Design a binder for this molecule. Structure first.
Ligand SMILES: O=P([O-])([O-])O[C@@H]1[C@@H](O)[C@H](O)[C@@H](O)[C@H](O)[C@@H]1O
Ligand SMILES: O=P([O-])([O-])O[C@@H]1[C@@H](O)[C@H](O)[C@@H](O)[C@H](O)[C@@H]1O
Ligand SMILES: [Gd]
Ligand SMILES: [Gd]
Lengths: 272, 272
């Protein structure tokens, strides 16, 4: 898989180049499932580039990509080598020129992530992680923080892409519950992949969200775990990649405390 | 004042060097008025340095600083030249190594800000602005966004430092109103001065908050205005540096629409 991975880092750098040239130019902003679910031409062409490049070298492999699943392809994860691609994680940031946009590639064999690559092109930061080998940013090794006390922790989360009132209501009240524990604070930079890479560096202690997709988190998940952190479902159980929920923490102590505090929001799975 | 200003830029870059070497070392964290109201040796160290060097060169000038006020100095603004200083805006970010911390200096004469310098040391970003002379980031000229439609805007705000349940419920309730207009999104980077600097560059369309202080916003306010933005009280009234409240928007249409939507929290003024 190291060949696949070496190839992946090369593709991520190239697609990052395209994303960061486009971010300063004029854009065609179109709508996906709602007025706040957006897509530009750059989302579409970068995903096209990546999928057809990988298919060339590795014609037997499977793909799950955002814009492809949007085009009618299905998100069904099987045992076959599958590349899980978000061409632009943080499309709303991109459209606004808010300076956090990531290219994300995860690679799963037997439904387990083997390596992940996250390229934050505006910052010039390349995060990579291979199962068993550690996590790196620009060739430097990452470690999660050591905080075990929730009342001294800094959390990252997002409000999400739903404006359904009851949903929005549970998101905000889950926030209030954690805020008033109290925790030191809560941050939102606008993309799941970068929020998670900030946990891996030890800049934040935990990230949680409900509503994300498998493509938003596949690459960054192995970066957290290889840096020493943990992935978990909001029930407190095992992380389920197709479930649309994630807690990504420095350790199980903080992970479990969050799970205990927050209420589950009902969501259709990626595999339904 | 250009000599004062050139001096200020030199001082901010210097102090930024202290902050950003300190951030990679262990801190003893201390509390002020609450368990989420944090201070370290560096906040105090840096403010002392800053105030000595200025009044070394400018004996007649007045000073307002966060840790000085915590040491019993009073935050009254006269017509005298006054340096308004936050050594570290983003102390909780600093403590955690969350990569957004700023040194902030504003300079007021006759109770109006003449110039402002904000140094985001981890990114190596120096934002400066002088009345009538424009806004710059590392030599590059800033311009706010053109967005006049609130339904297509991206906002920044912070949950703040109060854990009083009445206040917190108001903060989130105001959030919910705006989120559900709907706006494209809401981000939180953890420091007012950096939040406001993101508005000046055009990356975010507007920032608002209640509960901040004159030292959090004195430097970055003139950077937004010289980039073409507007400042305003959340009441709809004129911005008031001592009122603990601010909207910093790209334009009047957005600022007034926000004031309309949100309710005011009663706050103790800085000059009281
Ligand atoms: O659409 P996108 O920018 O690729 O992915 C985004 C995620 O990174 C973010 O965590 C989530 O809150 C947004 O709703 C959206 O899903
Ligand atoms: O205390 P500090 O780090 O100098 O300044 C911080 C501000 O930048 C931030 O906008 C606010 O939400 C925090 O409560 C705090 O006031
Ligand atoms: Gd995306
Ligand atoms: Gd401060």
């Amino acid at each position: 898989w190291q060949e696949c991975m070496d190839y992946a880092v090369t593709l991520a750098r190239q697609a990052g180049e395209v994303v960061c040239e486009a971010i300063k130019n004029e854009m065609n902003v179109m709508l996906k499932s709602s007025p706040v679910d957006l897509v530009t031409a750059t989302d579409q062409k970068v995903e096209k580039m990546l999928i057809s490049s990988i298919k060339e070298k590795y014609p037997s492999h499977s793909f799950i990509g955002e814009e492809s699943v949007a085009a009618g392809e299905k998100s069904i994860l099987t045992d076959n080598p599958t590349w899980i691609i978000d061409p632009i994680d943080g499309t709303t940031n991109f459209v606004h020129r808010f300076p956090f946009v990531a290219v994300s590639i995860g690679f799963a064999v037997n439904k387990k992530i083997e390596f992940g690559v996250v390229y934050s092109c505006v910052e010039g930061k390349m995060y990579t992680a291979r199962k068993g080998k550690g996590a790196f940013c620009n060739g430097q090794k990452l470690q999660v923080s050591q905080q075990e006390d929730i009342t001294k922790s800094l959390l990252v989360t997002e409000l999400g892409s739903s404006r359904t009132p009851e949903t929005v209501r549970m998101v905000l009240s889950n926030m209030e519950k954690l805020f008033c524990i109290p925790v030191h604070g809560i941050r939102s930079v606008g993309t799941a992949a970068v929020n998670m890479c900030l946990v891996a560096t030890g800049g934040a202690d935990a990230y949680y969200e409900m509503g994300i997709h498998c493509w938003d988190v596949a690459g960054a998940g192995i970066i957290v775990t290889e840096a020493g952190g943990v992935l978990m479902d909001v029930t407190g159980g095992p992380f389920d990649l197709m479930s649309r929920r994630v807690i990504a923490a420095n350790n199980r102590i903080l992970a479990e405390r969050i799970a205990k505090e927050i209420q589950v929001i009902p969501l259709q799975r990626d595999d339904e």
